[PDB]
Structure 1
Amino acid sequence: VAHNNVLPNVHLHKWWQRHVRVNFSKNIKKKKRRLLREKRRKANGGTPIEKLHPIVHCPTQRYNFRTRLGKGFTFEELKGAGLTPRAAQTIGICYDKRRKNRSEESLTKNVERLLKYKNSLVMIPLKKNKAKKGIGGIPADADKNTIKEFRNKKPLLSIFKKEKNTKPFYETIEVSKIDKEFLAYKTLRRAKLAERRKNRRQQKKDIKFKS
């Protein structure tokens, strides 16, 4: 090496030519994929090809304020809407047997999502022109007039999408409500200076309870 440059670093010391991959068909493939998932719809004959997923928070202090879709409702969320895991699968509803509900807010949020979904669909009888009640929490079948007059409306695929945040980032207050005698830095530092012994006292409490 001879000049004022950065010191070299490249990882090209094995037989690197055997495995190189140039992408010539990234748009051909998306055309193919679009046509396949469009062919599925014409075979489902009116029912959608999407499935309902819950709303969950993201796990870290880096992301815990925003939400996304999860892979399936819990057992306790399903019973809040009067459904069974086995019955719910036969509708486009997903089941997760290992997520939990550590708070009330998530429980009510997903129960409301389930109830909104269950309230906006018409059931087609198994044998035609033979309407019967439901089972396991499935709504009762529809009559041929409603079925005829709902095949011309546009299906709502917006229900499957994740919720949008609308929390504002500023607000207004009255000056007379301002607290003057507060000290945030001192609080933040006294809280750290005290953690070790509070942990110790909690462990002693745990030992006492165990007997």
Structure 2
Amino acid sequence: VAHNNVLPNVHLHKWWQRHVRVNFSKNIKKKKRRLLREKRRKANGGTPIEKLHPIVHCPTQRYNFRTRLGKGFTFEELKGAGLTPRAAQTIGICYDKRRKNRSEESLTKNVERLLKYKNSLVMIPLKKNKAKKGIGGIPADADKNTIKEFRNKKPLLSIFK
């Protein structure tokens, strides 16, 4: 070494040319993922591909004040919303068995989120004009007229955010 430079620290003492990789296809992959998600949301025919996730609090004192999307509503939250986990996972609601509600604030906030999602739901009959009032907390099946008039209206994707 010479002059007044930082002492060198470069970790290039192994065969690194075999490990170099450069992403020429970053935006190409962007396009491919966009196309795939567009194709599946066309395939499922109206129902959004997004699933409802709970609002949870980030751990550690660094991110104490911040909330984000957790994975899965708890059993207590699903019960407060009035539905079983097995039924909830069939209508785009994520459920996890690991989280627990240590605070009434989190419990009620996620329950009210679930209730808002349930009220926003409109259910398509399983058997083509054989509407039934549903089980496991699934809302009653919408009928032909409301389904027709709601199918041509923009979906509320802000609830998932």
Q: TM-score, normalised by structure 1?
A: 0.74
Secondary structure at 2:95 match in 1: coil
Cα deviation, residue 4, structure 1: 2.0
Question: In structure 2, what is the Cα distance between the partners aligned to 1:4 and 1:86?
Answer: 66
Per-residue Cα deviation, 1:5-24 (whole angstroms, up to 9, x for no partner): 22222112122212211221
Question: In structure 1, what is the Cα distance between the partners aligned to 2:42 and 2:119?
Answer: 25
Structure with the larger RCO, 1 or 2 (CA within 8 Å, 6+ apart): 2
| Worse-matched range after superposition: 48-57 or 127-136 | 127-136
Per-residue Cα deviation, 1:119-163 (whole angstroms, up to 9, x for no partner): 012111111111111111111111111111111111110000xxx
Which residue in the other structure is 2:138 paired with? 138
Question: In structure 2, what is the Cα distance between the partners aligned to 1:122 and 1:14?
Answer: 59
Cα deviation, residue 115, structure 1: 0.4
Question: In structure 2, what is the Cα distance between the partners aligned to 1:2 and 1:35?
Answer: 54
Cα deviation, residue 114, structure 1: 0.5
Which residue in the other structure is 1:9 paired with? 9
Secondary structure at 2:60 match in 1: coil
Identity %: 100
Which residue in the other structure is 1:148 paired with? 148
Cα deviation, residue 57, structure 1: 0.6
Which residue in the other structure is 2:20 paired with? 20
Structure 1 unaligned segments of length 5 or more: list them: 161-211
Question: In structure 1, what is the Cα distance between the partners aligned to 2:6 and 2:41?
Answer: 56
> Cα 1:2–1:142, aligned 2, differ >3 Å: closer, same or farther?
closer
Question: In structure 1, what is the Cα distance between the partners aligned to 2:103 and 2:82?
Answer: 20
Per-residue Cα deviation, 1:34-93 (whole angstroms, up to 9, x for no partner): 111100011111110000000111111111011000001000111111100111110000
Question: In structure 2, what is the Cα distance between the partners aligned to 1:18 and 1:152?
Answer: 53
Runs of 4+ in 1 over 4 A off after TM superposition: none
Secondary structure at 2:42 match in 1: helix
Cα deviation, residue 2, structure 1: 2.4
Question: In structure 2, what is the Cα distance between the partners aligned to 1:16 and 1:118?
Answer: 54
Question: In structure 2, what is the Cα distance between the partners aligned to 1:80 and 1:4?
Answer: 67
Secondary structure at 2:12 match in 1: coil
Question: In structure 2, what is the Cα distance between the partners aligned to 1:80 and 1:146?
Answer: 27
Matched, 1:83 2:83: yes
Question: In structure 1, what is the Cα distance between the partners aligned to 2:64 and 2:57?
Answer: 6
Matched, 1:63 2:63: yes
Structure 2 unaligned segments of length 5 or more: list them: none
